[model samples]
Target chain A: GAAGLGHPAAFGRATHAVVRALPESLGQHALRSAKGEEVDVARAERQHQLYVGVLGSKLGLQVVELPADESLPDCVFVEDVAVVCEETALITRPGAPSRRKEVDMMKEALEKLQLNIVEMKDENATLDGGDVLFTGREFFVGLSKRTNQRGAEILADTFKDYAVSTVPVADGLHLKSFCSMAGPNLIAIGSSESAQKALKIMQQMSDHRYDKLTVPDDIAANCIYLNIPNKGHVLLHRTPEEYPESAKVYEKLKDHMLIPVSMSELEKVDGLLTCCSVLINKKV
Target chain B: AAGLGHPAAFGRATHAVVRALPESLGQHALRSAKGEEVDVARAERQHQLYVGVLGSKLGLQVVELPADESLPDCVFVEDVAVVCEETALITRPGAPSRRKEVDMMKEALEKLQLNIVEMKDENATLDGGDVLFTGREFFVGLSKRTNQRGAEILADTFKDYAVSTVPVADGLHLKSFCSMAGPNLIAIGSSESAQKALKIMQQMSDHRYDKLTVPDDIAANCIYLNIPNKGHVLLHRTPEEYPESAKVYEKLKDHMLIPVSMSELEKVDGLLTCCSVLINKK
Candidate 1:
């Protein structure tokens, strides 16, 4: 019904889901989550299988999955390794020294994809995909533990066309930890004060208009929305079993085809639906 | 006498140029320091104790500049001039609001009977906080406040010492996350970005340096002085603001380490070296 949509958000044609398999060491993954729940390795693998299956089999995307590296416990979250914009790719020097070894593989991966790979020569510039949020139009980089001011500057330099803005993430692990894009110009946000603070900053920073959908649970607000050329609108969200009230909130989106997925084990170790994969709209 | 493993340096009349908090500080209460409430009284109290460490504890002649409430940032006098044993090079602070700070500093350096000079180029902008003198050479930070022209003039001011410019990426200044903990010993922050700047400095200079990595970023900003009879003295952040980092500084058993509260001053980007400019007169 919304025919006048200026441009599709995550509705990229010939989508490539750049994902990596989880190592057993995912149990020892670096986590800032307050919940003291221990990661169940076996259960996490089962959840990952369901996630990948939904991405390729159901959603219809080319799943270019990389093998697990036990040395890099957080290797499954390929998103933090690099930021992609059309033909160009900027490799992140992660704020966490433990994840510093994750970028080499990503640089090689993007190079094979025939993308213009960029690296931050200044050692002081640190960034993680976990802290980066790129809507179809602009970027809102969260200044977090894994991201710094210089990293945001480097990203802005790389993509001069996009209107770049830095957003302070005081409470959550990242800006996306409590907010993400649900549809065209529509932001799926959390009901927390920190989340609303971010929403206000984004609203003020941008010259464009934004629509918001707020959920009760902060983590439940993070969702994956895709606009496949012929297949129409698709949304990968948290299962009703995980968040019942938040699930009711998602019911309002009658236009989107929502597919619920459970990531209980991964959630314990700061992993989410957005963390494990780097969604790209490639030309080749 | 091998008291501290090094000879006491330029000991005739050493002076620490500092400034007191302005009486009208508390009026600027509307703004917060990155969302935390800033208390002007606490800032004043912190500076008083810091000056005491330099004068009473470290034995440097404390020359305190009278506070002008209109200049809220004048308390950080170190940014206005770079002082060493040879000469006092009055600087043009990169922050335009801080340009007025240099005139008062120039007068103090002149009264001290030290050779006082300045860069003739108006375009040249430098900050003493960004100038890291390792006792062997100088590492000038090319930051938003300090540019390449500023660095070139620094090289011109101190002709004897080897000067090199290093690009500053993140913080306000290079010393924002690093400081000369001791002679040829660089005390740096453990953060990834901080470590990167250290690596760049190492590659740029031919001289090798020993590193003391503090757990916290702000804790890396410290004052290292060689007092006449006292040997070596280091002024560092208090345990309240930097608990884990304070323990790291305690490892320098050979030096006298004084923990002072900078919690209040640090709110407005004031650092340990920010309040004072040490002039070692031979």
Candidate 2:
């Protein structure tokens, strides 16, 4: 009976990928640009299912799908609500006032997962999960229009066991928009000076060294590298049609299995591949 | 007589500050991304106030250069040369329009009796604003205004110290996003690449850094003053505009924050760090 249930021991090394269903009001999500773009809700829902399927069936992860809240348009981009590290899961107070309501559900999900929870409760503090990047050794939080200094300070305190450094997000909507760790020591970054400088500082702080693959297009830089049970490392990136130059990077990363996903509808509202799920690896 | 032939070389202190004329500021100031209107009169007052802070508050000897009305961006004197303790490297500005500004800075550096080196290679183009010194090493910004060739030249020029270059994310200059907050500390904005670059910077320096993250992009461009009597930071106070940054300042109980409003200068894409060149000759 225990073998059939979603017990941790059923899987040798368990991984939980938390995802939320796309809200019907996703077309009205908060966007960086003044001009609004059309988003097909039905198409987006299908894509979300495919993404969750990839995590559950293919990647051997326990897919935890929460109900869609029509009240929160940007709730599908769940990565901004909470950051789950090995030690604890820190619930973020989203920088956007409207998006703050999305964190309570994420906190409940994290608590249900039986992980230690740390809330960034300071009224002035505003941090987004999208702004936090785990580089194997430490966390790099980007101080953007959404994430503030107070939020970073709170992160530093909560993650005192790990090294935390803050960098200025000069160009993108979030830190992950330009930089992400592809492998144990491999990273993919953009050509932005802010991104380059932050990587340099992080490298100096850690014993673990990193080599980078430069993404010429800023949008293409937002990719996720997930470790599958049977498969070694799978790089989930945007389609080459979206970023013509990304094909070269895919070729360079020949060691890893490259999976290109179409995010046409999500891209309209400045969403990326990693925004849909928050992967938490459980030792149990 | 023997005394008449040998004139005494006057050397009060090893360091000398270089500032340029802001004559063309009113007529030809560079506009910001927002294309806000710039009041020339307010800019002049702000410039004067800044100069006064440097002289009286910071206690640095102020050396003023004759203004050239032709160069509107001459007030951003920091872009002309990369000054270190040993020598001053006169930069070849990437922008063709701003290349003329280097000559005035060179002349001033020469007068101060410091060795001057010029960027001779035609391929090299650098702006001093893109470079940040952390007392031990130099972190250069490979930006729109500074090229790879320029970064190579700077690495060669500062052969004694470690020189590394990082691509600028989105700003007029690197200092526009990050600056040295204090000893072994840097103030940076919340960009992904900028954070990575600082991580490498800290790694190269053997983990010698404490960072303060500023929420607002504009507030991240603060300059830490290493004055003899009092060590303070020159910060642009826009409380209504950047309340988050104000909270960060409140948490930063160590440094003394001297608030200076450069609203007019900001409209023209100028910051607190770009106005003057600070050099410690000793």
Candidate 3:
């Protein structure tokens, strides 16, 4: 009976995955507050392929891999370029001036998926997809060094129907580095005050209650929770070797299949599981 | 006085005034984080511009506090006490070096006929800069300068209003991270613990606070003024040194942002909110 549920036809709808190839210049990418480390470009490519493979083969999502741009090293982190909501796909102006070129590729992919495209054209506004986290009810934007106040205001203005709240990103490259929603009411948070503060604000703003699993290790807080149509929820997390405390999280969420993805090479440049791909539930 | 039963009427009659000390810049000022050389001559000019804005621009009655050559940081008068309608809670500054400046502030409040309550607890220390009032409630920041005992004392002193303490994650004080922007709005910095602090602030107040999170930490420290005549927010001009924060100010179009430069004072970690003490004396 479980094997019959695994078929792609049983899922009923197509889930679109927008991803980009790792650029050759990724080794020379800009590092802000991140400890400079040697990134193995070949190993990063292998890791990205496996990440895409899981999206298509296991999760039953249609993977649309975009061509790599040598000029933009961060083109691989597609999530920072555009945010795809249910009604519209908002093309974000990245906070880092150097990474603005990454948005063109994302716009093309969103249009192919047939989603209504909206661009944040405010000249002064600066937003990065990495600074934005979507809970089931509303969008929580982190005001970081990269993402400014104007960017949050623009998102709030555009997404009037949804409640948009700004949370301060205390000490990380992005907000996702310390928190992500794992289930409908389950949020995985790191031990930082910023992560806990964000969770409290989210709880107050939304009607839905939340139960959090505090990830002892900060790096493990960036786990991605994907909803598999009929099967159930699958948590794609970092390996226990990298996040030893996440072994307990695996044991806790035993009902949902936990897939450990090794991102050691990509993690060298502040890459997380959620950053590599932009998942959109849309029909082809 | 027969028809003046309303506190609002009394507030209206009383002039909102500020007590500021003359800028006495010295090489030996308390410094934290931002490392810049203090230009005394430039700082004196900036302090005059700030005092002028409070008086002519915002319509506050400006009162000058006598500058003591012995005390270099005495210009930050806001750190001396917590003043409300008729009560003035004089503080024992956490820094022993700043203790001498309190008596001068006490005498000024007494001249205005305010009932004074001195913070007498030997172990407790409170700075007015660490305290933020949002019309309805008081949020005392438990920072390195302001301890738990000081917060407890503030809670004890302000028996009529709800008072709460939020731990300062990084910064010299609580007002360093968050300040009231308007009636129900607050301006907060992009610090990880800032939201958590805001949550505590919201819980203590009757109304919910809508936060404006500034990307720059320094820009978050702003003071709001609802002047009877020309009303505008007295904001610290987003230092040209940081272009990113300057753009953040462009989005804050809801409030009339009156930019004032305090670049010289900022070198010693002095902010717009700390230069003068605001009080509506009846």
> Model 1's lDDT to the true fold?
0.80
Order of candidate numbers by lDDT, starting with the best: 1, 3, 2
| Cα TM-score per model | 0.49, 0.47, 0.47
After TM-score superposition, what is the CA distance of residue B214 in candidate 1 from its true location, in Å?
0.8
The sequence of per-residue lDDT tens digits that candidate 2 reaches over residues A1-284 is: 11122333321223888899988787655454446544646446656766776778777788899998988888898999888877489899988889888888898998999989999889999998888988767788888988999999999888878888887776546888777777656778877777677678767766677778888776677787766555566777877756868757766776677877767677778788878888887875
CAPRI-style grade of the A/B interface in model 2: incorrect
Task: Give the per-residue lDDT digits (tens) of candidate 3, residues B1-282.
Answer: 223234343123233334444443445455564366678888887788887877777666777876776566788888888876678889988765577788888888888888889997878989898998877778888886788899888887778878888777654788877777766668888867776777777776777778878887777888776555433354656557446655666675655666778788788678888887777754
Question: Cα-based RMSD of the predictions, in order?
Answer: 19.4, 23.6, 24.0
Q: Global lDDT of each model?
A: 0.80, 0.74, 0.75
Candidate 1, residues A1-284: lDDT per residue as tens digits?
Answer: 33333244433333678888888777765555576655646546656866887889777788888888988888888888888887788888887788888888877777888788889657898888878877778999999877899999999999888888999988548888999888768888999999999999999999887989999998998888877654566778998878989989998888777888887668887787788888777753
TM-score of chain B of 2: 0.86
RMSD, candidate 1, Å: 19.4
- Compare the candidates by TM-score and give the number of the best one: 1
Q: How do the residues B234-282 of candidate 2 rate in per-residue lDDT, one tens digit apiece?
A: 4554565577876776665655676677787787678888887877666
Candidate 3 scores a C-alpha RMSD against the true structure in Å of 24.0
Best by lDDT: 1
Runs in model 2 deviating more than 4 A are A1-14, A34-36, A204-208, B1-282
Residue B194, candidate 1: Cα error in Å is 1.2
Question: Which 10 consecutive positions of candidate 1 chain A have the poorest summed lDDT?
Answer: A1-10
